[PDB]
């Protein structure tokens, strides 16, 4: 009764970073050798558990969050980091547990004209709480005069676009990110490896 | 504060081939002001998040200004190539900082046609990062030495950006300011408020 990691890693389109997706995994046997056949340069940094020994373990509840970010912003996906992404789009708890996977996907998310479907929040009044999603699209008031719903002086639009292209540098090509969030609870294990 | 008014509100900008270079240091530089340059403009930032530029500190900050074609601004980026990138202004691959470009239709256009904005066309070799070339000797394209005549296989290397308001968006003048941040072992002084 294998877990459905194929429908998470082999999906046709990943969600935007600001409106990131969430998936629940439970009641299945999870073997992690299947995802080693991915792109040969996938970063597999794991906090709280060594990456190689993830098979013979009995987690209680497992999640999976997927989104697409720039090449240089893959560093901001770590506990305690700061920046635009770590504050306004996706914030990890300080005592985070689980692994992160990030592989370059220039061949799937890049258009010569420009892929405008991937956005990212730029302005917010306060930092995000750990694991909080905010998809509101109101005008940001950076001054004192009320915006009243107009994007004029001192009233900016919170969202920009990751206009991906295949001619961009290595640091601006898209990277697909999947974050697994294991845990241990009082209830007994529902997902166990072989 | 820090003198951005002299760099962002100057009457005229230098040609792309003979671009300017301004040294900025020991000032309180507020980068939040630059978000009101235009309703829509390019603010790509390389190696630094623009949202945390208001508290970092740098030993020196460099400002480079010029005017280029509207559709040709994409060449000002690390690891890119084209006409501006490898003949006029080369950005190093290990580049940290931001690039700012906004349309300048109402300031650098003439019905008769502006001829004061020039771009170099012919070179025997490309440009290393951050290197200028203001030489205007006649270019040799063939073999026989033309010793200073504009025949064929021997042309003047500099052409003109014949700017005019009737052009399309791709051919419209665009003012570009490139900030080149860096840190050294020296103490940093350029810090936001």
């Amino acid at each position, epitope marked *: 009764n294998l877990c459905p990691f194929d429908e998470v890693f082999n999906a046709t389109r990943f969600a935007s970073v600001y409106a990131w997706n969430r998936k629940r995994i439970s009641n299945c046997v999870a073997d992690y050798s299947v995802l080693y056949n991915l792109a040969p340069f996938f970063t597999f940094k794991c906090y709280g558990v060594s990456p190689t020994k993830l098979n013979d373990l009995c987690f209680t509840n497992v999640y999976a969050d997927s989104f697409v970010i720039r090449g240089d912003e893959v560093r901001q996906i770590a506990p305690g980091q700061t920046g635009n992404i770590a504050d306004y789009n996706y914030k990890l708890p300080d005592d985070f547990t689980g692994c992160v996977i990030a592989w370059n996907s220039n061949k799937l998310d890049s258009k*010569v004209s420009g892929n405008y479907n991937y956005l990212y929040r730029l302005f917010r009044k306060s930092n995000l709480k750990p694991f909080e999603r905010d998809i509101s699209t109101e005008i940001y008031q950076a001054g004192n005069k009320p915006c009243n719903g107009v994007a004029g002086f001192n009233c900016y639009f919170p969202l920009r676009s990751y206009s991906f292209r295949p001619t961009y540098g290595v640091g601006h090509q898209p990277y697909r990110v999947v974050v697994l969030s294991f845990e241990l609870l009082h209830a007994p294990a529902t997902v166990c490896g072989p | 504060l820090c003198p951005f008014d002299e760099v962002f509100n100057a009457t005229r900008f230098a040609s792309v081939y003979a671009w300017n270079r301004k040294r900025i240091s020991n000032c309180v530089a507020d980068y939040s002001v630059l978000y009101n340059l235009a309703p829509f403009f390019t603010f790509k930032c390389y190696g630094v998040s623009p949202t945390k530029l208001n508290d970092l500190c740098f030993t020196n900050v460099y400002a480079d200004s010029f005017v280029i074609r509207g559709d040709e601004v994409r060449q000002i980026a690390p690891g890119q190539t084209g006409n501006i990138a490898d003949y006029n202004y080369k950005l190093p691959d290990d580049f940290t900082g931001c690039v700012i470009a906004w349309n300048s239709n109402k300031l650098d256009s003439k019905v008769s046609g502006n001829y004061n904005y020039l771009y170099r066309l012919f070179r025997k070799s490309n440009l290393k990062p951050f290197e200028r070339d203001i030489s205007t000797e006649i270019y040799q394209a063939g073999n026989k030495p033309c010793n200073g005549v504009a025949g064929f296989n021997c042309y003047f290397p500099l052409r003109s950006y014949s700017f005019r308001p009737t052009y399309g968006v791709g051919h419209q003048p665009y003012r570009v300011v490139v900030l080149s941040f860096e840190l050294l072992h020296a103490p940093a002084t350029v810090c936001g408020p």
Partner: antibody
Amino acid sequence: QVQLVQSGAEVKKPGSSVKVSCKASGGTFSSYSFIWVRQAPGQGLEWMGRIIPILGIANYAQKFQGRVTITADKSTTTAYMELSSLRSEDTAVYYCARGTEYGDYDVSHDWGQGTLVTVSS
Amino acid sequence: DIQMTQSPSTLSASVGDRVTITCRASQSISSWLAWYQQKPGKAPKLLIYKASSLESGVPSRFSGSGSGTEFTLTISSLQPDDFATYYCQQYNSYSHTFGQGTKLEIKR
């Protein structure tokens, strides 16, 4: 759920210009992108351009630059297509399309009923 | 520009049969493609985008595949409401060209 309604038929002299409206009702206006496609009287379809009001980016076809302008009105949630300096072969049937943010901006998800433009004496 | 051609120009089929429409691009367009269906005198209808994803509301008998400079569209079981004209479209790089248009008809 989202249906698009265009204007009526138009007949113009060769040396004139045309304005075509495209009202879309339903959903959120911010995440909407409008594209325009022209169909010849007996030939296949033809692409003209794409407008994204939320990001303020516009792109037109190669031959149509300097003649066609596509704008959108947020308050009236309509779209406009201005084609100036008409010619004899510009007569065709004009369609208005919508690009959804979730699906794709460039792909046309919803279509208008279309309008017919005739240029003659 | 990228020039796309379809084949065959005209197809003749009967109800319950399986048909395939071949679509080729002059240059590589990655995995960006779209398929449309236009009935005589009516506005088109989106069927498939990204060459594999199926638009919501489209019946399950349709299916597409392709990687680069070669794409196909297949109908598992033809129905009386499937006789129309089909157009390709690529949205990689500006000037998003369409296809020549394949017309599918009935066999008498």
